[PDB]
Amino acid sequence: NPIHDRTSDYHKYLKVKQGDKRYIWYNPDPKERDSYECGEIVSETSDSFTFKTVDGQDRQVKKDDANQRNPIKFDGVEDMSELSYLNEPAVFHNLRVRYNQDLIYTYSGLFLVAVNPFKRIPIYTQEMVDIFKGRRRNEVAPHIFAISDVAYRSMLDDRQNQSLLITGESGAGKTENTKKVIQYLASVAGRGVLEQQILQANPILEAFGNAKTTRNNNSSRFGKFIEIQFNSAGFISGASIQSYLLEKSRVVFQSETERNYHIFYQLLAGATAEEKKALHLAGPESFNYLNQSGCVDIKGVSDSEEFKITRQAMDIVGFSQEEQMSIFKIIAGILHLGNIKFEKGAGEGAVLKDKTALNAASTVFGVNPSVLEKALMEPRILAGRDLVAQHLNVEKSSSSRDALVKALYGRLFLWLVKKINNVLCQERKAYFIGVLDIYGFEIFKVNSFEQLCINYTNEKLQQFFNHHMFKLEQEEYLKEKINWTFIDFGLDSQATIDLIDGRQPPGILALLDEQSVFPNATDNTLITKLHSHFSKKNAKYEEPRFSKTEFGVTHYAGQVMYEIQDWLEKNKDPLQQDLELCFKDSSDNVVTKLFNDPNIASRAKKGANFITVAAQYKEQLASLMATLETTNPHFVRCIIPNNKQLPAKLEDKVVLDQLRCNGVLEGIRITRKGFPNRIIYADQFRFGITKIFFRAGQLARI
Ligand SMILES: Nc1ncnc2c1ncn2[C@@H]1O[C@H](COP(=O)(O)OP(=O)(O)O)[C@@H](O)[C@H]1O
Ligand code: BEF
Ligand SMILES: [Mg+2]
């Protein structure tokens, strides 16, 4: 048995190795508050300590300001709830002592904390999977597999659906830990053909949905909620996937050093000679949508080998050979569309001198090139009562072409997800475990509409955590008749949530919708309206001193400033009707579905027109939260060690910044209020029915 055998790989890679006066943490330099050393207390007054620094000098500190150091026997503890002192340096210290020993997982009350190693650690083999089967949390070391098993056993024992919510910043480890949860469940609860199809769905969605960014070589540019479905006996019976917030803008623009979606590079590197001539392909350097960032490859990645893996995955899930060729025709067609060069004609209207790129796109898509040309440059628009062809200039022709491209890619992604769900999903499941892998709360140099949607999502998810914690504590105090009072910290989030999504008074999204669905609005009328409603009037909003295009929201994790440019266009997401008509006539069996199937081609109906993008997202998030409220949740907080993608480099400011805003420091302290330590009679106070409660510090003195 590996857990009692001290020679096992389990002991080597997952445990602190087992063999056969007063101190504080202080800053040598007060201008670097996250850099600490150890000092020894040598005397005291009623309100201060005097201690010796590392170089042997005397310094004084107030007793209320002092960060006391825990007894050294606690350095490396598996759950930080055991520590006497929970100040900032003490919590960071325990996480660092563990990281120094390649121990990346640590508990902190309800949280599993996971620090990215940026190297391979051999703790995810089938042999490691087998160790965690049926073990309680306090019976085995911290691990993503441990919380997965606890969720599975709770499903079987309590007959209740479960969820695992995995969060953190870009590059922190959300997607890798999600993959390990699915791996674990497929093993412990699997047979099989179905199980392989669930696992093989992942490379398909990562090829079309992930890309290299400055923060992560395999960054997710969408969110996902994966439901693993089980029969009443506890075996896997199906799965379903929901997708959120795909970054369609990446198809047409990438910042310096980043890439487009992986699939474009996979097709160009991996296609055969026959496929290349049939699709009119060349290298990535010959396509505008791939030749502007200065990066066409990723270190350690072979795009041709990845193309094989993508095609094998498509075969296993069950896409036909004709379906696969049509998918690649759409990817090729998008590249050709990006090479169309609009130029100024005799007047202000655009012309197309060379027809090569237009004809190549038209051939692969199966559309009429003369019809497509007129739809791009001379679309018929309703002006008053007249339907009239309007000759667009170079800027507007190019923007319309970009709109076509983004619509083709977004609709293709939806179709891929729907086809996967057709294979995997069941009408009759008994129970489920859901895993959420979505963008974390983050602040960038520019935050726009998509980032507001992300940070709004995380505001609701943090409220959900705080309300859960409140209910657990309330249950235990009222089950012991201990008549002590405390507040639900979930209530503290409601002001920010209402500022964003409220109806009356109207919030930010409601005002955006009002400006979008009637005429005469601009980005200036929009920002002006937001300030009119909220500046010096809502305590969670700020109008800037100088900027005319930005506004501030006070979130749980701090203030974020957002910009307004293009929000009206983003909320409507327009595409010319003559372009819709052109592609509705396609001879291709997949393209025809992207334009003729209303479940893919259109958002939902609202009034005499359609719902906006913001209203669609509010509804999508509300549906997700309703599902989560029916489950028993589990929480994983992923932490990135530095901003250089390097191992063995745990940077004090990078990590402490995350701990101050990811809820770890605030949460572990909240459970010290009142009476944290409880123990049955057999094993400063208020008497209960079966246990002895005790305020902070009392049990440690005993
Ligand atoms: N537990 C881990 N072991 C080894 N490498 C990891 C681990 N977790 C994260 N990675 C490394 O970090 C990268 C980014 O992780 P990822 O899960 O894609 O981040 P997120 O989904 O939070 O943006 C991975 O591609 C991998 O190189
Ligand atoms: F880049 Be990760 F997927 F947030
Ligand atoms: Mg990810």
Check whether 418 is labelled as a binding-site residue.
no
Closest ligand, as measured to the CA of 300 = 1
- Cβ within 8 Å of residue 601, ≥6 positions away: 411, 580, 594, 595
Check whether 170 is labelled as a binding-site residue.
yes
Quote the strand ranges of 481-572, DSSP E: 541-542, 550-555, 558-563
Closest ligand, as measured to the CA of 171 = 1
Q: Are strands 210-211 and 219-220 parallel, antiparallel or unpaired?
A: antiparallel
The atom number, within ligand 1, closest to the CA of 179 reads 17
610: CA distance to ligand 2 center in Å? Answer: 31
Closest ligand, as measured to the CA of 13 = 1
What's the distance, Cα to Cα, between the start and end of the chain in Å?
A: 35
Pocket test for ligand 2, best of 219, 262, 444 (most atoms within 8 A of CB): 219
Of all protein residues, whose CA lies closest to atom 4 belonging to ligand 2?
A: 170
User: Which residues partner with 108 through β-bridges?
Assistant: 111
User: Which residues partner with 240 through β-bridges?
Assistant: 227
Both tokens assigned to 238: 């199906």
Closest CA to 630 of 388, 432, 428: 432
Ligand 1 surroundings by CB, under 6 angstroms: 116-118, 120-121, 168, 170-176, 216, 218-220, 638
The atom number, within ligand 1, closest to the CA of 645 reads 12
Residue 124 near residue 144 (C-beta atoms within 8 A): no
Closest CA to 220 of 197, 253, 243, 239: 243
Check whether 173 is labelled as a binding-site residue.
yes
Q: To what resolution in angstroms was this structure determined?
A: 1.8
Of all protein residues, whose CA lies closest to atom 3 belonging to ligand 2?
A: 220
Q: Is residue 175 in contact with ligand 2, taking CB distance under 6 Å?
A: yes
Check whether 169 is labelled as a binding-site residue.
yes
Both tokens assigned to 21: 């006066």
Q: Is residue 70 in contact with ligand 2, taking CB distance under 6 Å?
A: no
Residue 102 near residue 125 (C-beta atoms within 8 A): no
User: Which residues partner with 551 through β-bridges?
Assistant: 562
Alpha-carbon gap, residue 10 to 128, rounded angstroms: 7
The CATH code of the domain at 449-570+617-630 is 1.20.58.530
Alpha-carbon gap, residue 231 to 250, rounded angstroms: 40
Closest CA to 324 of 194, 412, 202, 247: 412
Both tokens assigned to 399: 């923007």
- Cβ within 8 Å of residue 361, ≥6 positions away: 333, 336, 337, 340, 372
- Half-sphere exposure for 398 (CA within 13 Å, toward CB): 13
Quote the strand ranges of 523-595, DSSP E: 541-542, 550-555, 558-563
Alpha-carbon gap, residue 122 to 1, rounded angstroms: 18
617: CA distance to ligand 2 center in Å? Answer: 20
Pocket test for ligand 2, best of 178, 202, 210, 216 (most atoms within 8 A of CB): 216
Residue 54 near residue 38 (C-beta atoms within 8 A): yes
Angle CA 341–346–349, to nearest 5: 55
Both tokens assigned to 431: 């129970």
Pocket test for ligand 1, best of 112, 119, 176, 639 (most atoms within 8 A of CB): 176
Alpha-carbon gap, residue 281 to 243, rounded angstroms: 30
Of all protein residues, whose CA lies closest to atom 14 belonging to ligand 1?
A: 171
Q: What is the DSSP letter of 223?
A: E
Which residues are known catalytic residues? Answer: 170-171, 175, 216, 219-220, 440, 442
Check whether 584 is labelled as a binding-site residue.
no
Check whether 206 is labelled as a binding-site residue.
no
The atom number, within ligand 1, closest to the CA of 172 reads 22
Q: Is residue 173 in contact with ligand 2, taking CB distance under 6 Å?
A: no
Check whether 450 is labelled as a binding-site residue.
no
Q: Where does the chain break, by residue before each gap (C–N > 2.5 Å)?
A: 20, 191, 683
- Cβ within 8 Å of residue 479, ≥6 positions away: 689
Of all protein residues, whose CA lies closest to atom 15 belonging to ligand 1?
A: 173
The atom number, within ligand 1, closest to the CA of 104 reads 1
User: Please, which experimental method was used?
Assistant: X-ray
The atom number, within ligand 2, closest to the CA of 168 reads 4
Tell me the Cα Rg of the chain. Answer: 29
Q: What is the DSSP letter of 79?
A: B
Alpha-carbon gap, residue 406 to 403, rounded angstroms: 5
638: CA distance to ligand 1 center in Å? Answer: 10
